[PDB]
């Protein structure tokens, strides 16, 4: 009985149990309610995946959806990332070739937990590259139950992120391994993984910017080896040509100002390495200063070239969605759709402690340990940690991508303690204290997943006093009516939030979708939703609309209805038509927004108000109230 065989058996067993704990903690929305999809975004992913199942691949690549953005039509194959759809369709095809007849909605529901397992494995490998297996297994056990990654990965939520975190962790593992080994094979594998990441999510910008940043800091620390050259140059070239293949990316790796750090560090690295070669071959006493000065001049010249090409207009500037992360006040003023969404708002410490129980405290200790022992990969880890902390500190939605590094760092820290004291009274008390903290972490994660993030928005649940639960199922009722009691070519008008959900459930032609790529169309819809009946009727006649859908949550206590989202309609419509719609007009002369007799008569004759309050002045509940 060699301890090596039992050690490897224990490692395999603990990875399998981490897989099973990651798969089993994500079923609190399937045990209850039903195995259907939940949020607004996963419906489009589902619909296009269904198309890929029933028409093949070359039909999905050329797919011109005419049942969305009605008068315009949406080119789906060329304005979407085909990474989630292709993976779901491939698993569906493999699973139906073996005569295991599973419907594709079940694959779309249960795709995310399966990939959570692979994410745990990827974290294990990436942490084993930095520290001993112990930290690897501890990090694989940390990111399978952590609530920061469960939130937008629970079974039924079929979005870009479940695949994206796996691909991101695996690309980072492969780049660390390639830099350590120096081989071209690991760089080719890393390039293929980066191509997959490009096809999956719009978070490849983070990968490509982080890799130049790591290489540049390796240059400033005077740690330039030949392996870094053979890694980064091959990675950049192969990954560039691979990234240009996706239709939605296209030629953006050249024109955009997000992919210019990579070309900058590539040029600087070529110059640096040529000058160092010359230095080795020529005498050191003479021409040394000339070599130092030349490196500095090359870097300055690359910076000047980038500035000039950005300024003249050859290189397009940053997008607004990537510029709100720097300006931090540019969203609400100029383009209000960026500030409208609930995800694009900042994060309080409550979320940092609520998504990470003990990790957010032992995480800087692990960062400190990683700084103390410096290697080529640990510089990369430190930069990843700092960048993710900052980016998550300004946007709530992005916190998921921060969760991996935290786990890794925390694992390292905990492993460090279990290295020292484990193996009299003081050491025993230290071991029991750390183990008890881990117990508290596990119990906290289970509580948070049970009570907070396992809640669908399709079916609402109102709980009776005796513990009985009633399900308000009005969304699917109205959408099913709309599906089976209208013409096949009817056009519905709705706010952008539900644009996906109508075309997925109700299967009818919407005018404005959830994905926003033309803001003046949404401005027209907002003006129609916030004028009187005559102007709104003209707007509705010129677009050939038939039905109008409004969500009214006034009979029951539902927070987000269209009256609570009416002011953003007014602001978006004011952004493109300043002469017609005035925000100040819908407020009372005191300066507040109200629905009473004190409300403004410019709102009491609006179309949203006349539309969501029709024949409600006679609807009195049995409980004694007005």
């Amino acid at each position: 009985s060699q301890p090596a065989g039992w050690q490897s058996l224990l490692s395999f067993t603990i990875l399998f149990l981490a897989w099973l704990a990651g798969f089993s903690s994500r079923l609190f929305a399937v045990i209850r309610f039903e195995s259907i999809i939940h949020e607004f975004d996963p419906w489009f992913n589902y619909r296009s995946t269904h198309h890929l199942a029933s028409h093949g691949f070359y039909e999905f690549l050329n797919w011109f959806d005419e049942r969305a953005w009605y008068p315009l039509g949406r080119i789906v194959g060329g304005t979407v990332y085909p990474g989630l759809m292709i993976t779901a369709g491939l698993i569906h095809w493999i699973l139906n070739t073996l005569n295991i007849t599973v419907h594709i909605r079940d694959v779309c529901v249960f795709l995310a937990p399966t990939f959570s397992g692979l994410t745990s494995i990827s974290t294990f490998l990436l942490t084993r590259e930095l520290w001993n297996q112990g930290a690897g297994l501890l990090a694989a056990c940390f990111i399978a139950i952590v609530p920061g990654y469960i939130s937008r990965s629970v079974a039924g939520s079929f979005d870009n992120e479940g695949i994206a975190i796996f691909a991101l962790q695996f690309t980072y593992y492969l780049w660390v391994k390639s830099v350590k080994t120096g081989s071209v094979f690991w760089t080719m594998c890393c390039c293929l993984s980066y191509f997959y990441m490009v096809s999956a999510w719009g978070g490849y910008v983070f990968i490509i910017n982080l890799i130049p940043l790591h290489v540049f800091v390796l240059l400033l620390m005077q740690r330039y080896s030949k392996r870094v050259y053979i890694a980064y140059s091959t990675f950049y070239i192969v990954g560039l040509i691979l990234s240009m293949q996706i239709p939605f990316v296209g030629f953006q790796p050249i024109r955009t100002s997000e992919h210019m750090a990579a070309a900058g560090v590539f040029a600087l690295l070529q110059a640096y390495a040529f000058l160092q070669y010359l230095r080795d071959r020529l005498t050191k006493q003479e021409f040394q200063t000339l070599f130092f000065l030349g490196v500095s001049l090359a870097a300055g010249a690359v910076f000047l070239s980038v500035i000039y090409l950005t300024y003249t207009g050859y290189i397009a500037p940053w997008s607004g969605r990537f510029y709100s992360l720097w300006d931090t006040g540019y969203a609400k003023i100029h383009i209000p759709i960026i500030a409208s969404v609930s995800e694009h708002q900042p994060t309080t410490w409550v979320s940092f402690f609520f998504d990470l129980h003990i990790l957010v405290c032992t995480f800087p200790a692990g960062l400190w340990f990683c700084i103390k022992n410096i290697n080529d990969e640990r510089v990369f880890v430190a930069l990843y940690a700092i960048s993710a902390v900052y980016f998550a500190g300004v946007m709530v939605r992005l916190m998921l991508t921060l969760t991996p590094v935290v786990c890794m760092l925390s694992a390292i820290a905990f492993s460090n303690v279990f290295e020292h004291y484990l193996g009299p009274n003081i050491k025993s008390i230290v071991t029991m204290l750390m183990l008890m903290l881990l117990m508290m972490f596990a119990v906290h994660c289970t509580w948070v997943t049970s009570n907070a993030y396992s809640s669908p928005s399709v079916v609402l649940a109102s709980y009776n006093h005796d513990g009985t639960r009633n399900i308000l199922d009005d969304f699917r009722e109205a959408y099913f009516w709309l599906r089976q009691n209208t013409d096949e070519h009817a056009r519905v008008m709705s706010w952008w939030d539900y644009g996906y959900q109508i075309a997925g459930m109700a299967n009818r032609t919407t005018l404005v979708d959830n994905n926003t790529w033309n803001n003046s169309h949404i401005a027209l819809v907002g003006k129609a939703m916030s004028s009187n009946e005559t102007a709104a009727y003209k707007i509705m006649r010129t677009l050939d609309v038939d039905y109008v859908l409004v969500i009214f949550g006034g009979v029951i206590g539902y927070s987000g209805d269209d009256i609570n989202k009416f002011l953003w309609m007014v602001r978006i419509a004011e952004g493109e038509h300043p002469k017609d719609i005035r925000e100040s007009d819908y407020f009372t002369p005191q300066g507040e927004f109200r629905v009473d007799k004190a409300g403004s008569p410019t709102l009491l004759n609006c179309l949203m108000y006349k539309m969501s309050y029709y024949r409600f002045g006679e609807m009195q509940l049995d409980f004694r109230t007005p």
């Binding site: 949020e39 975004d41 939030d497």
Partner: peptide
């Protein structure tokens, strides 16, 4: 945390 308008 979804893709809706902040209410």
């Amino acid at each position: 945390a979804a893709n809706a308008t902040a209410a």
